[PDB]
Amino acid sequence: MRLERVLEEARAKGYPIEDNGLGNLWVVLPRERFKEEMAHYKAMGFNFLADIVGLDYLTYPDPRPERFAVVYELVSLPGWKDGDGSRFFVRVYVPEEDPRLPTVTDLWGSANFLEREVYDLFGIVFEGHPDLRKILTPEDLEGHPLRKDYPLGETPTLFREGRYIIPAEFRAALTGKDPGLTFYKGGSRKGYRSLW
Amino acid sequence: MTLNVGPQHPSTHGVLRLMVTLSGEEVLEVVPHIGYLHTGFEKTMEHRTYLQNITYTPRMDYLHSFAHDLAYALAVEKLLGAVVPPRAETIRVILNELSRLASHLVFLGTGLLDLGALTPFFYAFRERETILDLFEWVTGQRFHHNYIRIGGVKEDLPEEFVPELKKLLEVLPHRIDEYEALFAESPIFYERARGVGVIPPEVAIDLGLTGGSLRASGVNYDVRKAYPYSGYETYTFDVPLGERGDVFDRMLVRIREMRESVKIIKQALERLEPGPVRDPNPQITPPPRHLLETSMEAVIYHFKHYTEGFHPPKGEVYVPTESARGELGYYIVSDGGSMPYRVKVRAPSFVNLQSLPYACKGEQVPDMVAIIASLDPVMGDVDR
Amino acid sequence: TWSYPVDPYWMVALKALLVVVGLLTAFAFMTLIERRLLARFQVRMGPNRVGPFGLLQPLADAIKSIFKEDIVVAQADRFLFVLAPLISVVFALLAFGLIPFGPPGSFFGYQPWVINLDLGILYLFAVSELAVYGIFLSGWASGSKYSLLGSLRSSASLISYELGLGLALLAPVLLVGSLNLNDIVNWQKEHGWLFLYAFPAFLVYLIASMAEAARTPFDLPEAEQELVGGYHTEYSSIKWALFQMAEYIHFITASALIPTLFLGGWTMPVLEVPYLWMFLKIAFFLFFFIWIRATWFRLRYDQLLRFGWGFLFPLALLWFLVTALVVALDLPRTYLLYLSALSFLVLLGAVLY
Amino acid sequence: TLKALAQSLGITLKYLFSKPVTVPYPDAPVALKPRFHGRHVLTRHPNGLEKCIGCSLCAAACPAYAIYVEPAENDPENPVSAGERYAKVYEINMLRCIFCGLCEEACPTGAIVLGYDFEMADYEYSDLVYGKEDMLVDVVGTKPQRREAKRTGKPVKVGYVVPYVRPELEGFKAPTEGGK
Amino acid sequence: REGILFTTLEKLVAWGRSNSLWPATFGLACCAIEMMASTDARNDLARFGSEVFRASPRQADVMIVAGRLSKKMAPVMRRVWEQMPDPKWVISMGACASSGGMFNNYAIVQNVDSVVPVDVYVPGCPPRPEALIYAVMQLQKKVRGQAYNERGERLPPVAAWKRTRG
Amino acid sequence: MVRVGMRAAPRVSLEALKAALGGLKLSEAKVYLITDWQDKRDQARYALLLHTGKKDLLVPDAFGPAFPGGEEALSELVGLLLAQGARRFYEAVVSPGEMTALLDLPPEELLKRVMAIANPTDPGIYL
Ligand code: SF4
Ligand code: SF4
Numbered sequence A: 001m002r003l004e005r006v007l008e009e010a011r012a013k014g015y016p017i018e019d020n021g022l023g024n025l026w027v028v029l030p031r032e033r034f035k036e037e038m039a040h041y042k043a044m045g046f047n048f049l050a051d052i053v054g055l056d057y058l059t060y061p062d063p064r065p066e067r068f069a070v071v072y073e074l075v076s077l078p079g080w081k082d083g084d085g086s087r088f089f090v091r092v093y094v095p096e097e098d099p100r101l102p103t104v105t106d107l108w109g110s111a112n113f114l115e116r117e118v119y120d121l122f123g124i125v126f127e128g129h130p131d132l133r134k135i136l137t138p139e140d141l142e143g144h145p146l147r148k149d150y151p152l153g154e155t156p157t158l159f160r161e162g163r164y165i166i167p168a169e170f171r172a173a174l175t176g177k178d179p180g181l182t183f184y185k186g187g188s189r190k191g192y193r194s195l196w
Numbered sequence B: 001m002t003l004n005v006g007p008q009h010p011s012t013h014g015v016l017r018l019m020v021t022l023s024g025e026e027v028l029e030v031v032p033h034i035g036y037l038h039t040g041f042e043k044t045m046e047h048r049t050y051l052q053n054i055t056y057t058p059r060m061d062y063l064h065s066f067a068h069d070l071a072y073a074l075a076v077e078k079l080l081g082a083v084v085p086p087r088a089e090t091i092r093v094i095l096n097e098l099s100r101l102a103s104h105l106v107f108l109g110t111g112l113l114d115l116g117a118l119t120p121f122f123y124a125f126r127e128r129e130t131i132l133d134l135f136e137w138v139t140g141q142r143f144h145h146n147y148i149r150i151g152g153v154k155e156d157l158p159e160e161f162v163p164e165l166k167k168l169l170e171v172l173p174h175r176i177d178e179y180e181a182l183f184a185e186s187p188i189f190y191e192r193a194r195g196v197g198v199i200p201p202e203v204a205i206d207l208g209l210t211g212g213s214l215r216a217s218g219v220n221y222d223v224r225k226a227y228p229y230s231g232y233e234t235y236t237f238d239v240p241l242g243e244r245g246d247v248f249d250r251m252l253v254r255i256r257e258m259r260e261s262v263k264i265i266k267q268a269l270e271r272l273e274p275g276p277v278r279d280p281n282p283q284i285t286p287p288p289r290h291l292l293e294t295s296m297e298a299v300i301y302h303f304k305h306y307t308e309g310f311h312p313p314k315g316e317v318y319v320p321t322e323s324a325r326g327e328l329g330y331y332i333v334s335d336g337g338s339m340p341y342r343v344k345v346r347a348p349s350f351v352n353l354q355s356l357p358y359a360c361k362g363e364q365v366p367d368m369v370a371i372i373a374s375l376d377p378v379m380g381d382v383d384r
Numbered sequence C: 001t002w003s004y005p006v007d008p009y010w011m012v013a014l015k016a017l018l019v020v021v022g023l024l025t026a027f028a029f030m031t032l033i034e035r036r037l038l039a040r041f042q043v044r045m046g047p048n049r050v051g052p053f054g055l056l057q058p059l060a061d062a063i064k065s066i067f068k069e070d071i072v073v074a075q076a077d078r079f080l081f082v083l084a085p086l087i088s089v090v091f092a093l094l095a096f097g098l099i100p101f102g103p104p105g106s107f108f109g110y111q112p113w114v115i116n117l118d119l120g121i122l123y124l125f126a127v128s129e130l131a132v133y134g135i136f137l138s139g140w141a142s143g144s145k146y147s148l149l150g151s152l153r154s155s156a157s158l159i160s161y162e163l164g165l166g167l168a169l170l171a172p173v174l175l176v177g178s179l180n181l182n183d184i185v186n187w188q189k190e191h192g193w194l195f196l197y198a199f200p201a202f203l204v205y206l207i208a209s210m211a212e213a214a215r216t217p218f219d220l221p222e223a224e225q226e227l228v229g230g231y232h233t234e235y236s237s238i239k240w241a242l243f244q245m246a247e248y249i250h251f252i253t254a255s256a257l258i259p260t261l262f263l264g265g266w267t268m269p270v271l272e273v274p275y276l277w278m279f280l281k282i283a284f285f286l287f288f289f290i291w292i293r294a295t296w297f298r299l300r301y302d303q304l305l306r307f308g309w310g311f312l313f314p315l316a317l318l319w320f321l322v323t324a325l326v327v328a329l330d331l332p333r334t335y336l337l338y339l340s341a342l343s344f345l346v347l348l349g350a351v352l353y
Numbered sequence D: 001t002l003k004a005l006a007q008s009l010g011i012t013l014k015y016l017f018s019k020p021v022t023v024p025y026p027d028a029p030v031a032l033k034p035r036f037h038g039r040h041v042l043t044r045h046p047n048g049l050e051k052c053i054g055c056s057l058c059a060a061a062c063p064a065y066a067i068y069v070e071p072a073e074n075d076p077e078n079p080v081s082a083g084e085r086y087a088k089v090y091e092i093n094m095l096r097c098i099f100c101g102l103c104e105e106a107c108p109t110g111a112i113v114l115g116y117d118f119e120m121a122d123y124e125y126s127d128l129v130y131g132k133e134d135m136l137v138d139v140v141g142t143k144p145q146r147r148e149a150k151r152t153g154k155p156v157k158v159g160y161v162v163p164y165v166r167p168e169l170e171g172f173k174a175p176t177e178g179g180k
Numbered sequence E: 001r002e003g004i005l006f007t008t009l010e011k012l013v014a015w016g017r018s019n020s021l022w023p024a025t026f027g028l029a030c031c032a033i034e035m036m037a038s039t040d041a042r043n044d045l046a047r048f049g050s051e052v053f054r055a056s057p058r059q060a061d062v063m064i065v066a067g068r069l070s071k072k073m074a075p076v077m078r079r080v081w082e083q084m085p086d087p088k089w090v091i092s093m094g095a096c097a098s099s100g101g102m103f104n105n106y107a108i109v110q111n112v113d114s115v116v117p118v119d120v121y122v123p124g125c126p127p128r129p130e131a132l133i134y135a136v137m138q139l140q141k142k143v144r145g146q147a148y149n150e151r152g153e154r155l156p157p158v159a160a161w162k163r164t165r166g
Numbered sequence F: 001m002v003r004v005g006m007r008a009a010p011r012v013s014l015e016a017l018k019a020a021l022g023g024l025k026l027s028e029a030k031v032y033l034i035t036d037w038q039d040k041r042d043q044a045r046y047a048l049l050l051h052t053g054k055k056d057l058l059v060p061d062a063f064g065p066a067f068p069g070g071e072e073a074l075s076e077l078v079g080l081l082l083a084q085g086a087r088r089f090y091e092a093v094v095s096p097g098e099m100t101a102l103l104d105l106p107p108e109e110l111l112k113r114v115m116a117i118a119n120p121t122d123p124g125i126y127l
């Protein structure tokens, strides 16, 4: 029930409402309204903060507003005091040159680790955090691994007499921007979805 | 005493480093330090085909893998719209509950051994051996099994699988009841675990402790019940709970969970009817192996499917499931290419771990090992 | 040693050397038997390998023990590092000769025992204290405070229950009236199996032996899975071997002392055979104790301190005062039999609630 | 619940006197299922022709890209494959191989199929690249096994028994359930 | 004295060290669970001499790298090798440890032989418990001077005996 | 980032590095000995990339036993780096063609790639 009220509260102020026909909902809040709105979101009854998922869209085929985008996942547990079960995502775009975003540690302690992880994997600093300390990558590692401008750093596979493989030039798989080995891709290899 | 509990020592399973701020025999606060297992599934998956990633999905949580297999398969299906045969869903819940039995066996064995007696490790683990053989029948592998597919399961079950399942299903109830008789009527375990491991649900939620130790605190939230995904809606289901979150209620809730999983396995086995094994959509299924010598389109589609794969549409998707450590799901961003643009994993063991300094706050020093084994962490899930 | 002769000094040295190498072989093969018995407990089976019965595997183990780079760790005390295993072993070997394995002359001519001191339990008590000495000293000398804390837990617990051992041993002294083991065994020959009179104190003796690293505090600690233990974790080739050797000799020493003191040290009402009954009672206690090793949990050293200090020791001194009244007034010898039987029925019926 | 200590002891005793459950490898052959994931084998047709037409599909289905397939042109007089192509060089890096079963799945001529041998522990990295003549069905044993059989004079004893070989393993000789 | 300098004594001590292999696991990933399973009541490495399990490294001769070796752990595990008594052996268990495996990326050591001298490699994923026993028997015959490579060479009893630690 | 030494001249590369290193303290430096073919070190060739954090140093492929006097030069080199207080040694395995072009990429990409692919290595393999 509270999700419908979220949608009605957001639509009045001009917030885009994203929806796929699969049962997943997005409400994109600007960064100004982000903090206060999500504070209100906790006040609206969001006990549980599932995820903080950061996204780097450098190599995405279509352009996006900003390079980085951080998505928080808000839920209300059905089995607690008054449990509805309404779960949804909030996306907030973060510039390449402005990896700033207020923490919800004060709101949810759940983001204590989660936000740290995104500072490790992305260059995104979450302002007001108790400790933004590199979690996963070694202390002497330079950079942020999950952003697309950071190499995966593969090593060649080894064989008997000088026969070696460099997997990046061995992949028959394509990416979204990879043109393929023929003049073009259309049809199924431009995006494919069955009509149930 | 800012004590440096190093990685793997003293015998801290699931390689993890601890800084125990400690004066006396209490525990002031434990500062955990992780990352010693960072392998990069979220990064390597950006450079691997959708079908190839099913070989990468079980390896994160290596104990309860079939929940990862299911989550990934369901997410990609919803992303491109595959049609799951009913028998595939039945077999998927069978394998899911079976790997859950094996995961829970390992969790309680490691916990009892870590502090307590060394004997009860073997018996439970012995039953685990039996379970493992079942997978070898059908998958040819102990774990890290590549049996699931986008449509359903890889291929059909042998004749010899089900009777071994029935053997194990009949011997198991007495076995789980024996572990429960040994433990629940705790002679010394009661004076060890009943008090320790405080789980107030308010802070457990504030930190996001979803993994089955929240229901030990009296929160009735199960993904199999709250968000039915793979037909769990079609099963008679009792959800165990705990009165006050402690290690005793946690372990007993998980034992009752093992019995509830055995009951679900029986229930699904009864309603099993022969049929197909996966979604025949040629864009999603390679052509059957027998018409590879008859049809051209078969050769082209087999070749293409196994080299290029398929290209799901541009979009994002996510699906929830209940694993032995909590809410699990893959946030998959696809760019219309053979390999996913990004796969983010909601690692239930990652958010479950923020509640350790709180749980082992003020508790004894020896109990810090039990309170960690009782939290059931799989560091393949955390570090990831 | 009022009625017992004295062997020559050379014969005493011969018997001593024989007892020491026999304790060596015994602890090796008892490591084998404990391995296999724990194995049988958890339906896996033990080393049907290098033996057949495994009885050549300790040789390989000893062969590893030397050549294994006995290392002198830096930040460790040069002298105590090497000295502490020697202390722990020296003061563990002895206190086993006093145990009578037969009536006088049943060593094929000279003496079943090595030394039969007039004050035996005091000698046992002192050399039991010196084992804790070696434990916590090695813990200190290691130069690792992590292992030091484990040495401190070990020493505290062992010391507390080692104190309880005195009040445990008080009760039968009143009846027998001598501090030599042979008089006590002969009293169990005449009146019969002193534990029938003093079963409760027997209990607080038995459990006391559990605290001497036998098992079920099990937060002694061993370096594993808890605040690491002391007296190891820094010794590699032979000194570690000496630590384990002394601990196991202490285990078997308690397993041998428990029947000698309260139950029937060999001295059987039937067949009166010198050595075989004592070794078989040692085997019984050892099997029950390995059952405990396999079958029971830890205690965390806090509840261990509570149970020893608040429960065992006051009970032992209460029974000592009871027995002291009874003996000084000497009214019957039956009253203690009746009271111990009643007390056992009490501490038994309260179990199956 | 003081009774629980005695109950625990009682159950450990019952299980003590129950001896059996264990298998003494290598003295007892491990029972493996027919679908087990083991050492690769290359199968040949009944004519004796090799099935590998060197189409390098097993290498693409590798998530590690661990298979190297150099192809070559058949000699019509004494051919190796049935078509116009064969595998001159067919190597697998057992240290790169993860044992999926995707290569067996992608082989269109049924040449590459996972077997049952697991005894491929060896000492050197460069010795763990299994070759074609190290995986042909006609070969009996794993690399260290065969090498020990040569430097020892004793034939190879496999540490496994299976109820049967699958139809996909046509030709693969294995111990079958006690038929021998 | 290194188990050498007498024709009978060195064979004797090789026998002893071989059947006295004291495995010290360094459990890292899903390889480690298949090693722990090599201790249950179907297939126990508890016969050949490997029953006792001393977590301390000062006390064990065989070091089994069972799992993926992430770089952040590389020195720590490393030091456990330096803090071992000298007659010590190192086994590399599994694909991620032996080679880079399928995780051919920035994070994982592509051969654990980089930080520690590896004795035997054992492929598999995970290597079957019976395969891990095979590798420990392999190491048994290796320290007996009974092990040869494909090139005809005999392999020395102890790897980590030939390296200038630094 | 500076480049000293010359390809396939082990003694020239080693003497030039002796001169250029000077009194630079390497307590926090990162040593990257770049090679190909993990297993076979008897014929190995090595480049070197030393990242101080303040400035970097590049030595082309002139080290390793693959060249006359190369094994003793790599031993002297790693001994020198350890003498100056380094603890962090790394080895990157690149394709043969990468060894050549990677020294001709711009400094930022070469350094980022080497740092991303480097494996912790025991200097004992080079001593
Ligand atoms: S089983 Fe081995 S060779 Fe075959 S696809 Fe998998 S990892 Fe690659
Ligand atoms: S084994 Fe099969 S898939 Fe691989 S190259 Fe040969 S014919 Fe093709």
Ligand code: SF4
Residues within 6 Å of the ligand: B059, E029, E030, E031, E066, E067, E068, E093, E094, E095, E096, E097, E101, E124, E125, E126, E127
């Ligand atoms: S080789 Fe396989 S089983 Fe072993 S750690 Fe790697 S993924 Fe896990």
